[PDB]
Amino acid sequence: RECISIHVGQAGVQIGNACWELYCLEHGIQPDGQMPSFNTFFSETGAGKHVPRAVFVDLEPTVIDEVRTGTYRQLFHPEQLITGKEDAANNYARGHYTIGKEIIDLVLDRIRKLADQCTGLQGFSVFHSFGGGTGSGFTSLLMERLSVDYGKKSKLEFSIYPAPQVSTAVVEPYNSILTTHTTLEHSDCAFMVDNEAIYDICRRNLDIERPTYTNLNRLIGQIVSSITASLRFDGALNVDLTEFQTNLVPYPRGHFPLATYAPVISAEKAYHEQLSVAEITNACFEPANQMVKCDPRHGKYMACCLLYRGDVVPKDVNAAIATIKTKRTIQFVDWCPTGFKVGINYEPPTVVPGGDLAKVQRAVCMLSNTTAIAEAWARLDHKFDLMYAKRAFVHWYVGEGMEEGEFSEAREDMAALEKDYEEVGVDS
Amino acid sequence: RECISIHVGQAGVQIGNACWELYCLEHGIQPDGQMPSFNTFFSETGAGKHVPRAVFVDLEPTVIDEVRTGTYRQLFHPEQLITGKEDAANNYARGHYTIGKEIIDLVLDRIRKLADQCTGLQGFSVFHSFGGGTGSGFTSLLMERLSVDYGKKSKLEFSIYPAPQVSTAVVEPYNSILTTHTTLEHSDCAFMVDNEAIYDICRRNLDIERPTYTNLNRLIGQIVSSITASLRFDGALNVDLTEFQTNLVPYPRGHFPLATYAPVISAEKAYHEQLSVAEITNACFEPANQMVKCDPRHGKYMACCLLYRGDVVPKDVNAAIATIKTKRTIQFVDWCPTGFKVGINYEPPTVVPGGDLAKVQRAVCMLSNTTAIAEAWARLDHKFDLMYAKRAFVHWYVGEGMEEGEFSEAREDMAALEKDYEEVGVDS
Amino acid sequence: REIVHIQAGQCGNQIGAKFWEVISDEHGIDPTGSYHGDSDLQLERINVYYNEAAGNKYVPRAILVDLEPGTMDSVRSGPFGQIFRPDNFVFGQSGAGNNWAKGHYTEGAELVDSVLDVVRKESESCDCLQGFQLTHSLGGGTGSGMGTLLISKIREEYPDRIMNTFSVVPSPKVSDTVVEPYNATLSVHQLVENTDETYCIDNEALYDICFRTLKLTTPTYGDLNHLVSATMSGVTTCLRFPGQLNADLRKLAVNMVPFPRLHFFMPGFAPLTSRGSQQYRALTVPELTQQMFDAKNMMAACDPRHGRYLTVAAVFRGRMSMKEVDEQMLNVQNKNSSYFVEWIPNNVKTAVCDIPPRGLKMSATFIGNSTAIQELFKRISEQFTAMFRRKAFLHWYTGEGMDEMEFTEAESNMNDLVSEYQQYQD
Amino acid sequence: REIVHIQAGQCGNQIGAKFWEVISDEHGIDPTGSYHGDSDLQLERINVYYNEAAGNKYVPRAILVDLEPGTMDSVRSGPFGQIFRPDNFVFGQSGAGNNWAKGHYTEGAELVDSVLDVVRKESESCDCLQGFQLTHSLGGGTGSGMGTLLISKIREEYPDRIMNTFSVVPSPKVSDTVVEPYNATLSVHQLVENTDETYCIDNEALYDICFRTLKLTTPTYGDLNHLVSATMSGVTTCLRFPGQLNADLRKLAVNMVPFPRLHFFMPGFAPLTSRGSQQYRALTVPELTQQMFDAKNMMAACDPRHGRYLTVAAVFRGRMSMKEVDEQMLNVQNKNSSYFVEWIPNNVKTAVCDIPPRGLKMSATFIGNSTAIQELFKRISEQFTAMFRRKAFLHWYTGEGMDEMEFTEAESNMNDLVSEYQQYQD
Ligand SMILES: Nc1nc2c(ncn2[C@@H]2O[C@H](COP(=O)(O)OP(=O)(O)OP(=O)(O)O)[C@@H](O)[C@H]2O)c(=O)[nH]1
Ligand SMILES: Nc1nc2c(ncn2[C@@H]2O[C@H](COP(=O)(O)OP(=O)(O)OP(=O)(O)O)[C@@H](O)[C@H]2O)c(=O)[nH]1
Ligand SMILES: Nc1nc2c(ncn2[C@@H]2O[C@H](COP(=O)(O)OP(=O)(O)O)[C@@H](O)[C@H]2O)c(=O)[nH]1
Ligand SMILES: Nc1nc2c(ncn2[C@@H]2O[C@H](COP(=O)(O)OP(=O)(O)O)[C@@H](O)[C@H]2O)c(=O)[nH]1
Ligand SMILES: [Mg+2]
Ligand SMILES: [Mg+2]
């Protein structure tokens, strides 16, 4: 019943920092590993120290060093903290090939070591970003190997969705297009969120006009914990990760369920307001709490999964579902009946001490696969196209051995993906 | 059994401030929402805090900020307090169109959120003023949407009637004429009062020669509470808001019942004087307590509703009615028999601590639809005409996209309305 | 929500010196720049006129413009010249010399580009502008000349913001420049159609008030510009602070302008009497209304009862009853019905703020738009014609390229405003 | 992970004198060589620029090169000249005299072998080089002449390391050498294709900034080179220190170069204003972005809004929100969309470091690659042609064997860069 977390790149690792901090908060784990009390994620020592079963990869020493100098440096095993010396430079060509390919063997052997520590490997999940060099480059490299060795294990990916308006990486389209090509075909499911959309959540629901990544990742951590801690904890409907895959992936392509999370409420907003299960789920179908800037009303739904924490009575859930099925404007694709996975944990929602979110007594996470995602690809299509037509920055990949045909090909694979969304949109 | 209050504009909000203060006084609600004890208006939290189901709209931050810095800032949910940055400038053209139309979607979504919080929405009522930019401009904009979404719910409006002698808004005729055009057709019933008439009440019955709006709105609040708090509380004849509409609106045009309220008595005037139900109702048919400067003796009655608080015995009421039907000079229109709605609540009348009105043991509110209202329209007709003939101030609307034909049209709609009053006056 | 103010000309710069002083008084801001007040409101709406710079420093949102460093320096040398940042001092070198052509048409034109750049920088610094205000003289070279040029460009950049200006109108008795009516004529030609509204201040009238009711025998321009700033500050504070009525500048503009071209105002102010009588005065709403209506308390050398009143705004500061205000305004309308225009029912409008001016219990600002204003235009136009025929000093102007037909059109335009006042005088 | 820096020419040597000073400031390293800081980070990533010698001595990983001992001596004589080891002073005897031919082609060529040997010794001392940086003038003899020669050999030895250089670009007004455009032309001919990237610094622009926004009336080259070092140090510290974004120099290079040949940069810097206004400034992300975008805060005498922007890098130092940065950069892109090139979606890229420069709360470095750069090339090329036809001072150069056809090709190559900027200007 075990799983592995993999943190690649800054985004992967810094999100991971929040994630493991939250898992410590879930059980009262001390920075040194001492836990007085979740062995699905952790491995126990004779001292009662538990080791989070995870791998941290950075090709630049700095971020891992940040871990190594922080409080959780005692928690993590030195072998889990893997670092190279040089970067990918925002560039798949080095991340996947030239540079990252050198260290990956080590990385894999640490993974395999942990796989041998697992007794019942259920699977794993990889945290990264769609635009970066290691964030997406190295990441796909890893998938190429992990899908061989662990072909039957859960291969869930979580990635930051490139913001349409702000991006620090000029060749991000190129990176992301190459990842599509290689991740679609290897991964089982990839989830993503938009930091821009999140900012809007922070300013509207948390009332914060100063979000940093350390805020943004707390919110992400919430979502992740709902599906990682609480799915291993007790509930009414205990849903596994393999079950998630078995209930969220409808086609052999990928699919890309997007996150939505409600409650996201400031302490003051929690006052004077009573949420019910149904009210929280109402919020879950509002564009306003959509974690990716993509309009839910534009597309049609294919999948939807609702996962519940704390004070949730199935009775209320059932009523809530009835209304979301019938009251809303949620259009859905023919193919699908509304079999929405309901996970119901008794495990209460948790809050980070010193965080922004209010203590809540119940909480709902929503995953959804909508046809509007093709518009996200359309965004990438043109951004890629523009650059590629001019061949701007192309020498930074070509010099590492990339082929122009390959890039065209990858775009075409994306186009095919868009076409399949088109297909799904056609009802039948 | 729930309802929504909507406060638009300063007039709407400042009146609302008095209204919600009174509701707090009705039940002992603390500024923080803590109530130790009316859930038709309020929504309960797990802390026992109740939230008044209402929306506050101001396009200028200041008045809402006044709320936000006062004691009731803890009572109101931050989302209920909606503010823009700029004003309508006394002008429908911006209030309804150019400016207010931008924020209204937010406003509506907060309303809809509350509508979803309601389980049995009975309806709602809107507080505003006939002359202002948001007071009437934005207001009608709202009605345009609310009448679609909540077509079957109570749409009661309350508005300040432009004083014939004092008005601070030079284009008030123009604003009010445009509202007629758009509110007549959308709203169900609009009530109004004249601050000038009220001043006369304050100086003659309360003996106060220094009324401010904070006095004036207390008196308005009294009237409103009689029909809002006490209609949800227990009585002999428990009358609902929908019942009010069903008992006050005779035609599909609008109608405009005017308020009259007796007792309005200073503490010293209460001494040495014993009011009965009948005596209070005698006062209700006196011009002297008429809340709008319009002569009750001029027109003919069409509707009349009497709502009773505290120590009222139907026995006495019946006798009182007999005398008002037969003793008075109240002429009434043929169409109507004297079926005057009697609401009889056991709920006692309440008084604002530090207010001007005396503690009374019983109280009567009167609503009435008289043909004299056409004279009020006549006032507007000429005021509008004068301006419009010269085309004074016209550029302040035209520049926002208003049409001259439209203005003519709106006047004509008013003329038609006057003609329908003429019609009703003709007995048949 | 915010306002940018630009001062120009020696007049405008010295008026602004008092204006900003007062605004900081209103908010408890020290001459050096930091906030040392003591009321919540004092900081609460400070944004309209100040940027808070790091360190709790407040920067007045205004540009000081001139073509002679020395005037700017004298401004800078006093208290509150230190609160302005160096970047708000935009000036050239060599005067204008009270020459429109230099100011507008040629040399001053050169500076305007740098001014505007700073304007743009400030427009970005604001969250949302309500408008702009400029202070200047109608018969001056930089005051009107360069100032006008600037206005035409600002309006162009921001059609949707309020553009108003207060300006010193050549008094019948004291003109300084021989062609002061010429400069004024040209400014009408340019300003009227490039502004939302303009205020008419007459120094002569001001000197009469200061002795007539205030009984003072030593005023300077700083004392008279204090009175000017009282009216300017009166207007914007309400917009800033909590009140009862309708406290928005644009709404004021809407209520005061019945016709696209006739937007000239006569400011007045109450209470405004000597200390001796202060022991014999009563403070009531009728008291303020008596002072407001009285033509002698107008700051413009006009006579509203000679003309007809188109619009009247009565702004009140401090706690007053609504009733009393309503009734007294009605009474005014009633008793002075012979001066009001019949086309506008209830031509007297009000605005109410609950914050009194520092040191007073109550106060009121009178803003009027009468037809009487046309008399000032008539005086100027006439004087202009005489000069026009002789070309007095026009070699200076034509020497800088100003063409006489442009002036001819300017003359017409003055006459047009008069005829339109006649058209609505009836 | 490490960087080697080589300074050459009187310019380069004096710039480096400030650069290294700053780096040691950043890490708390004393002018004598030992570490006396006080932050963990100060030693933590020190490796990129220092070798710790026995005794807790830090040796700057750089070579000082000249052909006149006296300049070297003056460098050595000040604080931080003692931190450099004697072995890093490589120099000859007899100038170059600002002669490319001497520097590159003949005499200076002789010294380069000894320089390179030391370079090799340092390349071995490093664990893993990230790259190399050189400081020099484009129109100088050793700065460009000898320096270029060195670059071609270093690149040859290390194709896989970053080769960049910062160089003083002949300002339109102050050329010292009559053939300064000639030397520059030759350096383009050699450098552009033998470097990964080059930065364009104009002293004239720098002198304008120091008076324009900094309001200073006494700067020297040390004060202007301080500003230069601010940008240089800004870049590498992030790479050194913990941040949020993507802090690798190579990645910067990748994001800023769309085409193999067009790698010229316009550095700029924020905040960068006088102390007076510091009491009236607010420190926000938009504040920095306003200063970064503004062409007057560029250190290159170009005008980015004249040309088109190909790439923009915004590097931030200190604690900022990600949201705010993202939004303001987006806004910039939006509002200045008319200058950006349509082929690159979201052409503004960011990098974020959480360590502020000593003494400031926040700071930002602007790096741009516009087409506007071509204007500098055009000025040089033109001036070159005139000289070319006359052979001004070319007897000195041809006397040392430089052939005119090589110069002819150099001219073409300049024109080629301009045409390629036109090819992507569209
Ligand atoms: N939510 C979130 N997004 C982040 C975080 N850090 C970076 N990102 C986003 O991820 C992308 C940045 O990737 P980089 O940091 O440049 O690169 P990397 O993927 O770590 O790998 P390299 O390019 O080789 O350094 C941008 O789109 C950022 O907005 C973080 O802590 N949280
Ligand atoms: N009874 C009562 N009447 C009020 C109150 N405030 C204003 N009024 C009246 O309502 C009208 C004023 O509307 P304004 O305050 O100018 O404007 P608004 O309707 O709030 O909206 P804007 O014009 O955009 O500011 C006048 O006729 C006032 O006499 C109040 O508190 N109570
Ligand atoms: N109220 C007032 N008027 C002033 C002041 N200074 C000059 N004036 C008036 O302005 C006119 C002269 O224009 P001036 O300001 O010198 O023009 P400029 O300086 O060349 O732009 C005369 O009518 C003066 O009475 C002042 O400080 N206050
Ligand atoms: N910024 C800057 N420029 C310098 C310095 N020294 C010389 N320069 C510039 O360099 C050019 C002259 O080249 P120079 O450095 O004397 O050449 P070299 O010494 O023979 O290699 C002129 O354009 C100067 O402005 C300096 O310390 N700082
Ligand atoms: Mg990284
Ligand atoms: Mg208002």
Q: How far apart are the first and last CA of chain D?
A: 38
Where are the strands (E) in B334-392, listed by range? 341-345, 362-370
Chain B: touching chains (3 or more CB pairs < 8 Å): A, C
Could you give the CA distance from residue C98 to residue C184 in angstroms, rounded to a whole number? 11
Name, in order, each residue with C-beta under 8 angstroms of D230's C-beta and a sequence gap of 6 or more: D22, D269, D357, D365
Residue listed under structure tokens 């690649």: A8
* DSSP symbol at A138: I
Q: Report whether the peptide linkage leading into residue C286 is cis, meaning its omega lies within 30 degrees of zero.
A: no
Q: How many CB pairs under 8 A join A and D?
A: 144
Q: How far is CA C242 from the centre of its chain?
A: 23
Q: Which of A79, A138, A85, A139 lies closest to A112, judged by CA? A: A79
- Ligand 3 pocket test target in C6, C11, C393 with most atoms within 8 Å of CB: C11
Q: Is C55 on the interface with D (CB under 8 A)?
A: yes
Question: Contact at 8 Å (CB) between D65 and D8?
Answer: yes
D125: left (phi over 0), alpha (psi -120 to 50) or beta: alpha
Cα C373 from Cα C302, distance rounded (Å): 6
Q: Which residues make beta-bridge pairs with B130? A: none
Ligand 1 in reach of A213 Cβ (< 6 A): yes
Beta carbons of A51 and A45 less than 8 angstroms apart = yes
- End-of-domain residue from the set D258, D283, D309: D258
Widest CA span of chain A, in angstroms? 61
DSSP strands (E only) in B28-90: 42-44, 50-52, 54-58, 81-83
Rounded distance, CA A170 to CA A161, Å? 15
Helix (H, G, I), strand (E, B) or coil at B26: helix
Q: Which of A145, A141, A153, A215 is nearest to A179 (CA)?
A: A141
Q: Which of D295, D292, D294, D293 is nearest to D303 (CA)?
A: D295
C296 and C239 in a common domain: no
Beta strands per DSSP E along C264-323: 264-270, 309-317
- Residue in the block written with tokens 């010099």: A399
Phi, psi of D340 (to 5 degrees): -75, 150
Q: How far apart are the first and last CA of chain B?
A: 39
**C246 vs B132, B393, B395: nearest CB:** B132
- Spatial distance between the Cα atoms of C99 and C106, rounded to a whole number of angstroms: 10
A199 and D326 in contact by Cβ < 8 A? yes
**Structure-block tokens of residue B379:** 């006032």
Are the C-beta atoms of D374 and D417 separated by less than 8 Å? yes
In this structure, the number of other CB atoms found within 10 A of the CB of residue C324 comes to 18
Q: Helix B213-226 to helix B9-27 angle, to the nearest 10 degrees?
A: 60
- Whether C19 and C91 share a structural domain: yes
Cα–Cα dist D211/D227, whole Å: 13
The data reach a resolution, in angstroms, of 5.3
Look at chain C and report how many structural domains it folds into.
3
Distance, in Å, from the CA atom of C182 to the CA atom of C166, rounded to the nearest integer, reads: 19
Cα distance from A311 to chain B (closest Cα, Å)? Answer: 13
Cβ count within 10 A of residue B127: 27
Q: Does D322 sit within 8 Å of A382, measured CB to CB? A: no
Least Cα distance to C65 among C108, C22, C4 occurs for: C108
Residue A77 near residue A52, CB atoms below 8 Å: no
**Largest interatomic CA distance in chain D:** 61
CA separation for the pair A187, A139 (Å, rounded) = 11
Neighbours of B260 (CB within 10 A): 27
Map tokens 């070591």 to a residue. A113
Mutate to test the pocket of ligand 2, among C130, C244, C246 (most ligand atoms within 8 A of CB): C246
Same domain, D129 and D148: yes
- Which secondary structure element, helix H or strand E, spans residue B11, and what is its range? helix B9-27
Burial class (CB in 10 A: 0-12, 13-18, 19+), D411: buried
Task: Quote the tokens at residue B280.
Answer: 């209070």
What amino acid is encoded at C208 in this protein?
D
DSSP readout, C357-385? PTT-S-EEEEEEEESTTHHHHHHHHHHHH
Centre of ligand 6 from the C-alpha of residue B51, in Å: 25
Q: Which of residues 249-278 of A touch B (CB under 8 A)?
A: 268-269, 271-274
Q: How many residues does chain C have?
A: 426
- Provide the domain limits for residue C288: 259-372
∠ CA A34-A35-A41, rounded to 5°: 110
Closest CA to B374 of B309, B310, B422: B422
Angle at A275 between CA A274 and CA A279, to 5 degrees: 135
For residue C199, give the CATH number of its domain.
3.40.50.1440
Calculate ∠ Cα C420-C421-C423, nearest 5°. Answer: 60
Within this chain, do residues C139 and C280 fall inside the same structural domain, yes or no? no
Record: contact D322-A65, CB cut-off 8 A = no
**Token pair for C361:** 């219990």
**CB–CB of C267/C313 below 8 Å?**
no
B243 is catalytic: yes
3-state DSSP assignment of residue A153: coil
């036809």: which residue's tokens? D389
Given 3-state DSSP classes, what are the helix, strand and coil percentages for chain B, each rounded to the nearest 5?
A: 45, 20, 35
Helix (H) or strand (E) holding D131: strand D129-137
Q: What's the angle, vertex CA A53, arms to CA A47 and CA A59, rounded to 5?
A: 120
* Shortest-distance ligand to the CA of residue B165: 2
Asked if residue D71 and residue D44 are part of one domain, the reply reads: yes
For residues D239 and D350, membership in a common domain is answered with: no
Main-chain dihedrals φ then ψ at residue B67, nearest 5 degrees: -65, -50
- The size of chain B, in residues, is 428
| Residue C262 DSSP symbol | -
Q: Are residues C274 and C215 in the same domain?
A: no
Number of Cβ within 10 Å of residue A36's Cβ equals: 8
Please answer whether residues A42 and A17 qualify as being in contact, where contact means their C-beta atoms are separated by less than 8 angstroms: no
Contact C342, B386 (CB under 8 A): yes
Q: Is B30 exposed, middle or buried (0-12, 13-18, 19+ CB in 10 A)?
A: middle
DSSP character string of C46-92: GGGTEEEETTTEEEESEEEEES-HHHHHHHHHSTTSSSS-GGGEEE-
Helix pair A404-425, A373-390: axis angle to 10 deg:
160
Q: Contact B286/B275 with Cβ under 8 angstroms?
A: no
DSSP letters of A76-114? S-TTTEEE-SS---S-HIIIIIITHHHHHHHHHHHHHHH
The answer to whether A11 and A160 are in contact (CB under 8 A) is yes
Give CA angle at B357 (B355, B363), nearest 5°. Answer: 135
Contact C33, C57 (CB under 8 A): yes
Task: List, edge to edge, every strand of the sheet that includes C162-168.
Answer: C89-91, C62-66, C2-8, C129-137, C162-168, C197-201, C264-270, C363-370, C309-317, C348-353
**Residues C3, C34 share a domain:** yes
D199: nearest Cα among D299, D254, D266 = D266
Helix axes D180-191, D374-390, angle to 10 degrees: 120
Tokens of B258: 């005017």
Taking the C-alpha atoms of residue A66 and residue C65, their distance in angstroms, rounded to an integer, is: 53
Experimental approach: cryo-EM
- Together in a domain, D325 and D216: no
The DSSP result for A357-387, as a single string, is: BPP-SEEEEEEEEETTHHHHHHHHHHHHHHH
Please provide residue C350's backbone torsions phi and psi, each rounded to the nearest 5 degrees: -125, 160
Residue C82, token pair as written in the block: 């230190």
C128 touches chain D (CB under 8 A): no
* Strand A154-161 versus strand A189-194 pairing type: parallel
- Is the Cβ atom of C142 under 6 angstroms away from ligand 3? yes
Q: Which one of the listed residues A243, A375, A422, A423 is annotated catalytic?
A: A243
State whether D225 and D272 are in the same domain: no
Give the HSE-up count for residue B232: Cα atoms under 13 Å, Cβ half-sphere: 16
Q: How many angstroms separate the CA atoms of C146 and C106, rounded?
A: 9
Among residues D258, D286, D310, which one ends one of the domains? D258
What CATH number has the domain bearing residue C421? 1.10.287.600
Burial class (CB in 10 A: 0-12, 13-18, 19+), C183: buried
Please provide the distance, in angstroms rounded to a whole number, between the alpha carbons at the two ends of chain C.
38
Do residues D378 and D319 share a domain? no
Whether residue D6 is found in the same domain as residue D90: yes
Per DSSP, which regions of B207-257 are E strands?
Answer: 235-237
Chains with ≥3 CB–CB distances under 8 Å to A: B, D
The answer to whether residues C27 and C157 touch, using CB atoms and an 8 Å cutoff, is no
- The CATH number of whichever domain residue D276 belongs to comes to 3.30.1330.20
Residue A182 in tokens: 């290689």
**DSSP per-residue string spanning C190-249:** HHGGG-SEEEEE-HHHHHHHHHHTS--S---HHHHHHHHHHHHHHHHHHHHS-BSS---H
CA distances from C389 to A44, C160, C172, C382, C407 (A): 105, 40, 20, 11, 11
Q: Do B392 and C258 touch (CB under 8 A)?
A: yes
Q: Could you give the CA distance from residue B40 to residue B55 in angstroms, rounded to a whole number?
A: 15
Is there a contact between B370 and B302 (Cβ–Cβ < 8 Å)? yes
CA atoms within 13 A on the CB side of D295: 16
Domain boundary among D258, D273, D292: D258
Of A138, A119, A117, whose CA–CA distance to A129 is shortest?
A: A138
How far apart CA B280 and CA B262 sit, in angstroms, is 6
